[PDB]
């Protein structure tokens, strides 16, 4: 996925809006709690859980300087819910975003 992956920070921005909502760790703690990516300090702004766009929304934010940080999160999505039905929007995202790894190099 390398040459077309490369892009995935710019991806985990779009990554963050589309998925913030249908997200993990908004739903108990439990699937961010799974890796405890960072500490508990960090965890605790996204326990702050009011109106729907914060809740994920400083989770995801968090990790995004932290290459797999936010990987972490959507490695643990792959079959989350119901199925990779998300995963594949993302695949998408990766797979598309390979025009904008041109863009950055020119």
């Given at each position: 996925?390398?040459?077309?992956?490369?892009?995935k920070?710019?991806?985990?921005?779009?990554?963050?809006?589309?998925?913030?909502?249908?997200?993990?760790?908004?739903?108990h703690?439990?699937?961010?709690?799974?890796?405890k990516?960072?500490?508990?300090?960090?965890?605790?702004?996204?326990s702050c859980?009011?109106?729907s766009?914060?809740?994920?929304?400083?989770?995801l934010?968090?990790?995004?300087?932290?290459?797999?940080?936010?990987?972490?999160?959507?490695?643990?999505?792959?079959?989350?819910?119901?199925?990779?039905?998300?995963?594949?929007?993302?695949?998408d995202?990766?797979?598309?975003?390979?025009?904008?790894?041109?863009?950055?190099?020119?």
């Open positions: 996925e390398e040459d077309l992956t490369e892009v920070k710019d991806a985990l921005e779009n990554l963050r809006v589309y998925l913030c909502e249908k997200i993990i760790a908004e739903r703690f439990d699937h961010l709690r799974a890796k990516i960072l500490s508990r300090e960090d965890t605790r702004e996204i859980r009011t109106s766009r914060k809740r994920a929304g400083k989770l934010d968090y990790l995004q300087e932290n290459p797999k940080g936010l990987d972490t999160l959507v490695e643990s999505i792959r079959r989350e819910k119901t199925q990779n039905f998300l995963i594949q929007k993302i695949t995202e990766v797979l598309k975003l390979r025009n904008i790894k041109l863009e950055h190099l020119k």
